[PDB]
Design an enzyme around this catalytic site. Structure first.
Site, PDB file in Angstrom:
ATOM      1  N   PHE A   1       7.986   5.565   7.851  1.00 12.33           N
ATOM      2  CA  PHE A   1       7.270   4.674   8.759  1.00 12.33           C
ATOM      3  C   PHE A   1       7.550   3.195   8.481  1.00 12.33           C
ATOM      4  CE2 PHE A   1       4.539   3.716   5.236  1.00 12.33           C
ATOM      5  CZ  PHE A   1       4.492   4.902   4.519  1.00 12.33           C
TER       6      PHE A   1
ATOM      7  N   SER B   1       7.190  -0.148   5.698  1.00 12.37           N
ATOM      8  CA  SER B   1       6.427  -0.645   4.555  1.00 12.37           C
ATOM      9  C   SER B   1       5.099  -1.220   5.012  1.00 12.37           C
ATOM     10  CB  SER B   1       7.229  -1.708   3.799  1.00 12.37           C
ATOM     11  OG  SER B   1       8.389  -1.136   3.219  1.00 12.37           O
TER      12      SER B   1
ATOM     13  N   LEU C   1       0.824  -1.205   0.000  1.00 18.14           N
ATOM     14  CA  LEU C   1       0.000   0.000   0.000  1.00 18.14           C
ATOM     15  C   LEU C   1       0.859   1.256   0.000  1.00 18.14           C
ATOM     16  CD1 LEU C   1      -2.814  -0.957   2.538  1.00 18.14           C
ATOM     17  CD2 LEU C   1      -2.870  -1.007   0.049  1.00 18.14           C
ATOM     18  N   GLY C   2       2.043   1.164   0.597  1.00 17.83           N
ATOM     19  CA  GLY C   2       2.931   2.309   0.641  1.00 17.83           C
ATOM     20  C   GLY C   2       4.131   2.054   1.525  1.00 17.83           C
ATOM     21  N   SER C   3       5.129   2.921   1.428  1.00 16.90           N
ATOM     22  CA  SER C   3       6.329   2.783   2.239  1.00 16.90           C
ATOM     23  C   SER C   3       7.001   4.137   2.376  1.00 16.90           C
ATOM     24  CB  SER C   3       7.299   1.791   1.593  1.00 16.90           C
ATOM     25  OG  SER C   3       7.904   2.359   0.445  1.00 16.90           O
ATOM     26  N   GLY C   4       7.791   4.300   3.431  1.00 15.95           N
ATOM     27  CA  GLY C   4       8.474   5.562   3.660  1.00 15.95           C
ATOM     28  C   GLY C   4       9.182   5.563   5.001  1.00 15.95           C
TER      29      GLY C   4
ATOM     30  N   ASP D   1      -7.021   7.868   2.852  1.00 11.87           N
ATOM     31  CA  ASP D   1      -6.397   8.770   3.812  1.00 11.87           C
ATOM     32  C   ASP D   1      -6.840  10.194   3.485  1.00 11.87           C
ATOM     33  OD1 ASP D   1      -3.938   8.102   1.672  1.00 11.87           O
ATOM     34  OD2 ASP D   1      -3.889  10.210   2.260  1.00 11.87           O
TER      35      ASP D   1
ATOM     36  N   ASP E   1       2.496  13.432  15.500  1.00 13.79           N
ATOM     37  CA  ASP E   1       2.568  13.503  14.041  1.00 13.79           C
ATOM     38  C   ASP E   1       1.177  13.603  13.421  1.00 13.79           C
ATOM     39  OD1 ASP E   1       3.874  13.770  11.650  1.00 13.79           O
ATOM     40  OD2 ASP E   1       4.034  11.608  11.282  1.00 13.79           O
TER      41      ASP E   1
ATOM     42  N   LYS F   1       2.180  -3.889   8.677  1.00 15.07           N
ATOM     43  CA  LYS F   1       3.230  -2.877   8.693  1.00 15.07           C
ATOM     44  C   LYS F   1       4.561  -3.428   9.203  1.00 15.07           C
ATOM     45  CE  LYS F   1       4.108   1.686  10.962  1.00 15.07           C
ATOM     46  NZ  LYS F   1       3.344   2.804  11.607  1.00 15.07           N
TER      47      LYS F   1
HETATM   48  F1  LIG Z   1      -5.387   1.836   5.383  1.00 12.52           F
HETATM   49  C1  LIG Z   1      -4.266   1.071   5.482  1.00 12.52           C
HETATM   50  F2  LIG Z   1      -3.354   1.524   4.581  1.00 12.52           F
HETATM   51  F3  LIG Z   1      -4.472  -0.239   5.190  1.00 12.52           F
HETATM   52  C2  LIG Z   1      -3.759   1.155   6.940  1.00 12.52           C
HETATM   53  C3  LIG Z   1      -4.534   0.607   8.085  1.00 12.52           C
HETATM   54  C4  LIG Z   1      -4.026   0.699   9.448  1.00 12.52           C
HETATM   55  C5  LIG Z   1      -2.741   1.339   9.708  1.00 12.52           C
HETATM   56  C6  LIG Z   1      -1.940   1.901   8.606  1.00 12.52           C
HETATM   57  C7  LIG Z   1      -0.649   2.625   8.838  1.00 12.52           C
HETATM   58  N1  LIG Z   1       0.032   2.573  10.014  1.00 12.52           N
HETATM   59  N2  LIG Z   1       1.065   3.383   9.865  1.00 12.52           N
HETATM   60  C8  LIG Z   1       1.166   3.990   8.682  1.00 12.52           C
HETATM   61  C9  LIG Z   1       2.030   4.933   8.054  1.00 12.52           C
HETATM   62  C10 LIG Z   1       1.729   5.344   6.697  1.00 12.52           C
HETATM   63  C11 LIG Z   1       0.592   4.841   5.953  1.00 12.52           C
HETATM   64  N3  LIG Z   1       0.352   5.230   4.647  1.00 12.52           N
HETATM   65  C12 LIG Z   1      -0.638   4.551   3.844  1.00 12.52           C
HETATM   66  C13 LIG Z   1      -1.989   5.209   4.105  1.00 12.52           C
HETATM   67  C14 LIG Z   1      -3.075   4.675   3.182  1.00 12.52           C
HETATM   68  C15 LIG Z   1      -2.662   4.744   1.718  1.00 12.52           C
HETATM   69  C16 LIG Z   1      -1.339   4.035   1.460  1.00 12.52           C
HETATM   70  C17 LIG Z   1      -0.228   4.565   2.356  1.00 12.52           C
HETATM   71  N4  LIG Z   1      -0.199   3.932   6.645  1.00 12.52           N
HETATM   72  N5  LIG Z   1       0.041   3.498   7.973  1.00 12.52           N
HETATM   73  C18 LIG Z   1      -2.474   1.787   7.254  1.00 12.52           C
END
Ligand SMILES: FC(F)(F)c1cccc(-c2nnc3ccc(NC4CCCCC4)nn23)c1
EC number: 2.7.11.1
Length: 273
Positions: A17, A19, A12-15, A96, A135, A35
């Protein structure tokens, strides 16, 4: 065994925080998020009543338990040789706040009010539970599109709430207060209120108010979009240069602009469906 009870999906994404992957609990098909965080890049560690050293987010998410749906839920976590893996709740469909704002532009005040109100309830809950997020921003806010409920995510830069000064910070600079920029010192609640002021401006204008350090310390707010006088007032109050001049959570929710908020479901029906 992690790999067993969970079926991994796409990235879904990385950075900073780490992956994050989409996934599903093979057990009952429950949608989840996986995560991964590398041990060598953890900004703040915590310890559980055991004595087990773990990433702060785990300690923090365990402290803010309860049926309260305003804070993302930690389902489980695993430790690997060089990393930790967190299993988090995953609403579906979801989006988001950052992406939502990017596609829709500045939000109508009625919608911004509903969203801001839910963010405030979520932050109050964290504080009441001894947790400081550090944050707060659109990227760290999830929208459960079907129910119209917001979820605060990524407590990876957080800390236990304390009444003394904080001299460490690894959150997002453009959302950090003047006191941190100038003296590398800030107190929990007032710093949070400043970031909330940045967030509210973001919602009603479609972008953040300050880009450079000089702008943050000067704190002069210019509205690039048409915004009500009452909303403008709340924003400037949250962004008061002096920490003690900022409103408390109670003052923010008792503010004239915050009255008559829509219920989450009404919000979804009117602005999301
Ligand atoms: F909705 C989702 F992605 F399944 C989800 C569900 C529950 C927690 C987390 C979570 N916990 N830390 C971070 C840091 C960054 C980040 N960024 C994503 C945000 C959405 C679009 C893709 C990047 N999510 N995240 C993500």
């Amino acid at each position: 065994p992690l790999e067993s009870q969970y079926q991994v999906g796409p990235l879904l994404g990385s950075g900073g925080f780490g992956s994050v992957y989409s996934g599903i609990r093979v057990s009952d098909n429950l949608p989840v998020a996986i995560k991964h965080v590398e041990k060598d890049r953890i900004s703040d560690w915590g310890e559980l009543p055991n004595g087990t050293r773990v990433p702060m987010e785990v300690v923090l998410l365990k402290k803010v338990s309860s049926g309260f749906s305003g804070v993302i839920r930690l389902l489980d976590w695993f430790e690997r040789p060089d990393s930790f893996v967190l299993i988090l709740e995953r609403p579906e469909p979801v989006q988001d706040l950052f992406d939502f704002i990017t596609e829709r532009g500045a939000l109508q005040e009625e919608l911004a009010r509903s969203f801001f109100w839910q963010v405030l309830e979520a932050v109050r809950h964290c504080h009441n539970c001894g947790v400081l997020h550090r944050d707060i921003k659109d990227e760290n806010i999830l929208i459960d599109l079907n129910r119209g409920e917001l979820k605060l995510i990524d407590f990876g830069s957080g800390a236990l709430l304390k009444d003394t000064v904080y001299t460490d910070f690894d959150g997002t600079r453009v959302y950090s207060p003047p006191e941190w920029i100038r003296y590398h010192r800030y107190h929990g609640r007032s710093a949070a209120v400043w970031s909330l002021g940045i967030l509210l401006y973001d919602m009603v204008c479609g972008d953040i108010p300050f880009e450079h350090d000089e702008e943050i310390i000067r704190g002069q707010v210019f509205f690039r979009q048409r915004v009500s006088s009452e909303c403008q007032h709340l924003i400037r109050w949250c962004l008061a240069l002096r920490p003690s001049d900022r409103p408390t959570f109670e003052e923010i929710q008792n503010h004239p602009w915050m009255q008559d908020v829509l219920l989450p479901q009404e919000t979804a029906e009117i602005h999301l469906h």
